[PDB]
Design a binder for this molecule. Structure first.
Ligand SMILES: [Mg+2]
Ligand SMILES: [Mg+2]
Lengths: 50, 114
């Protein structure tokens, strides 16, 4: 069913768009930052960000 | 990723006050807890001969081999040495006073694993 396929593509394509807008905002406009400086990335970076 | 702070291994020192005109500081690796020593510094209150000895006995100095490393003159510091001795190699370092009187001697460095 090509109309169902294309309905699925149109849906997924828009959802991807939502996700782009979301992620771009989320990354660009966070007021806080944890500079890992190539080290202690992982749990310590997550905990430091919290 | 794991990050460790490195502190240098145990300090070692031998010293004598008023060592007489032909007497000596016998630096013995038995006094170190890791059993071997690396002397970096020799502070001498007058002229001295430095001698490296191997013992024929495991725990007392009975001279098998003896080499005079250097002669230092005047009062001052020799530093940045790696004069090396250990108990299991039966190695002793001797500093002999050659001044016309009594002097003070302070040797310092660090321990090495036997
Ligand atoms: Mg802040
Ligand atoms: Mg020995």
């Amino acid at each position: 069913d090509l109309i169902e396929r294309n309905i699925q593509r149109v849906g997924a394509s828009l959802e991807n768009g939502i996700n782009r807008v979301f992620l771009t905002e989320l990354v660009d406009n966070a007021q806080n930052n944890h500079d890992t400086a190539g080290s202690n990335q992982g749990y310590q970076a997550l905990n430091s960000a919290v | 990723t794991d990050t460790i702070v490195n502190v240098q291994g145990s300090f070692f020192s031998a010293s004598a006050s008023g060592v007489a005109d032909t007497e000596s500081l016998l630096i013995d690796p038995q006094d170190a807890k890791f059993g071997a020593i690396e002397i970096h510094n020799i502070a001498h209150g007058g002229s001295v001969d430095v001698e490296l000895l191997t013992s024929s006995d495991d725990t007392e100095l009975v001279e098998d081999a003896a080499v005079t490393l250097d002669s230092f003159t005047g009062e001052g510091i020799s530093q940045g040495n790696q004069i090396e001795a250990s108990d299991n190699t039966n190695t002793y370092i001797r500093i002999t006073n050659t001044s016309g009187g009594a002097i003070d001697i302070i040797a310092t460095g660090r321990e090495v694993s036997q």
